[PDB]
Amino acid sequence: MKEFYLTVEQIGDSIFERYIDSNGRERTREVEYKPSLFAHCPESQATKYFDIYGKPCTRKLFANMRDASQWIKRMEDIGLEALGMDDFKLAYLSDTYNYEIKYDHTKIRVANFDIEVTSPDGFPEPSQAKHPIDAITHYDSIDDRFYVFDLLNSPYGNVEEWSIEIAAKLQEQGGDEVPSEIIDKIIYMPFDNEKELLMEYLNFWQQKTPVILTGWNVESFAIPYVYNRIKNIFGESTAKRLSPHRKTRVKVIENMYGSREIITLFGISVLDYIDLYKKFSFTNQPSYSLDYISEFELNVGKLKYDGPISKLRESNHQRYISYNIIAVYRVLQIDAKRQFINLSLDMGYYAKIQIQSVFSPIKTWDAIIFNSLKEQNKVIPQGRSHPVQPYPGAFVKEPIPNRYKYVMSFDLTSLYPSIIRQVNISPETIAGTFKVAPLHDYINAVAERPSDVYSCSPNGMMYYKDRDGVVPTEITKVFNQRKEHKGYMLAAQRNGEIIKEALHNPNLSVDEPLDVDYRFDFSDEIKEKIKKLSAKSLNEMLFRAQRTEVAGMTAQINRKALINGLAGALGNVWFRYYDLRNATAITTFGQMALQWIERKVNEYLNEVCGTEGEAFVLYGDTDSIYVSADKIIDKVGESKFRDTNHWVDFLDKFARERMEPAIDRGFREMCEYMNNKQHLMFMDREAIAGPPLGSKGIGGFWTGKKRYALNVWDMEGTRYAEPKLKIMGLETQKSSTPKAVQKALKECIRRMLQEGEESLQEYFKEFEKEFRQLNYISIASVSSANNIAKYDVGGFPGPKCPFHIRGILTYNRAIKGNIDAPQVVEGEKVYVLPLREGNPFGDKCIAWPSGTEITDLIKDDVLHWMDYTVLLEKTFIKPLEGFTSAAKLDYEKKASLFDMFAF
DNA sequence: TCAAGTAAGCAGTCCGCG
DNA sequence: GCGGACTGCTTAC
């Protein structure tokens, strides 16, 4: 096989690389790498290196990396550009792996660990590490084994050995229900004292040195704690053994706001799964406790135990250890589903960066662009400092707030990247400017053609049309991968609906799930076989189809985040290729494109329907348009339709055969108008929405910009077995809205859109009656909590004190001088509840760490003093009244009148 | 919440608004 | 009480 790096670091004048060699063995080397940088020179100087603008450069080979750094400094002092890759390890990888890397994950040691530390006197601060580590479970991907390190003797209690037998038994039998599938994979090692535990751990570590090191909060907790506890007991040198190169760096951070300390272990690539989850998952969670995330992702009931965690070890060591093992596993389970580790390796190897740099699209794109340019003997520009300037983005149409019965949406394929490609937008394809007219002029096709020669954006920029720029070229590469996985994602989806469909008529028999590949649309043969299956088998397949769809969503959306990250980076002053001319050429092109195709659609529809001036486009945001189809449905009748599927078929057909051609034509014109390099404005039908036929549903509604709801029957070719609600921006979709309330608001929306006013009133009233029965966590608001210290004076609320922050202050007072009480953590999320007047807490609300039960120290009084009425009308009623008025209907009947004597 | 971008909504505070 | 100037937070894209 071809070799690949595992990790790379620059330590002084040496590069340290861990790699897999041509024979599949992990190796390590130290290399005194001599970097090259560049500087402009006179033309006569016949060279083979040119800066991206075609200016000739001379390569300067330095004896070592310090010299090269120093040279950059001097070039600055003199005031000349120092060109080339100044991050030397990236240049190293580029020279060392001058090919498309093919990795083998089975050779890569991915280590997943979790530790426990008993602490009775507060949260065990990693930088303090004053408490013994009494448990460590460390899973190794190569061995596929859970290594358990169990402290038996501590100042906080002496315990007996964990029992794998009891671990396996059902919770209902006194066991801990450690899943049978990993029971065999557990290597258990009890220790008589902590020193012996930690020494063995390091020895173990030296032998199976993590390449990728992950887990849950390992970067802000596990790692710095192990590092500092070993340092406290044995000294730095021993602690530095966590680094294959024995080099570590204390490190921090970024604001804004405050700071935190992490330990940088050289030679290791740390991908804290919480951070991976935050970047790649596209969810916003009320809490990021592993318990909460586990239940969310896997639907596993949270691990339960009596007493505080700080007493768990000594009252129930059995469970303590078992839960440390399950913690490690839950993370493995999330990854098997979401597959963020795979995604990270893919991206890091693609770009040829430290794996952990996938967290940075700027670092990622620098590297992609640099390797691409280096291939042609081109030299990259020096990174320069810029002041931060605001700059305009997308256009958002103001909608008339209303109900909307029949809606079809259309959406441009991957807008910003497509604009980059169509226009040929790149640092080195800038051809000049033209005298701009107001945007509206281009929109209405009255402005003079910007250029007969170059490819233009309405922001005034012109671009070469002879050759593709490196930004278009490279962005095209990731766009195509993205597209491939989206195909797999959508096919797994369509397939899922077929299984769901079958689940209406499950056959009575024992059989197996069909061995198929859910990334591809089912063959008619597989379709027949599914109709003949049992519910148990159909359910299983459905599970696998949905797991395929999730795998595809991970692969596709994050490749989209990457390429969209490029368009955005052009607006970030830290990007080597930062340029507001290019950033705004992209966003201004977008504005034009959307309102241009709005004018076109309206025009098309006023002709076909034989009217004038009608606004068929009711809304639009960035790259999408929403068209009112009432009139298109009416033309046929609305009777004349057997069922709901019948008109969806009709609308589908109309979109595909009449509108998209008209839409393509409109965009082809615009391409010519801007004299663009390549027409890539592809706007496909996205959503088909309306109420069930014969129903009183209102189909859809809008309250304003970025706030709407729709009863979707078909989405991007996926024809749902059950209508799916697409709700955007409304409180159902916000993490700050209480769980119970979201659910309730959603049912309310479902009833409005599917059943109508009367079904709506009925539920709203039923909810209002039963509200007070809801569990307190399910009805608490949620907020991030920033700048507490800022508004703390009393500690009472200082001037301008935010509501949630005030709640925190109320909490802090209630638990004053209570060392065990859970502490609200600056920058994290809290649950918030209002409190009735005259409550013992002395304020109008209280707040506590989200994800948790509020301590037993105050729970009872909080429950007694919760203001249900306030809570209710702020979170449920008010927003609901917002929906109903925009929709022009009533959540309460409502004069009869009628009836006979009740009148 | 270290880690590409802007647009824009709603909650809440403070205070005007005769 | 509703709305602006504003801070904080959170979506859509």
Ligand SMILES: O=c1ccn([C@H]2C[C@H](O)[C@@H](COP(=O)(O)NP(=O)(O)OP(=O)(O)O)O2)c(=O)[nH]1
């Ligand atoms: O996080 C984002 C999301 C979108 N955008 C911009 C770029 C994107 O092209 C445009 C429209 O985003 P969509 O959510 O519609 N996805 P996109 O159009 O990129 O591709 P697709 O619709 O095929 O997913 O909005 C960002 O800048 N950042």
Ligand SMILES: [Ca+2]
């Ligand atoms: Ca799009």
Ligand SMILES: [Ca+2]
């Ligand atoms: Ca899309």
Ligand SMILES: [Ca+2]
């Ligand atoms: Ca059947």
Ligand SMILES: [Ca+2]
């Ligand atoms: Ca969109």
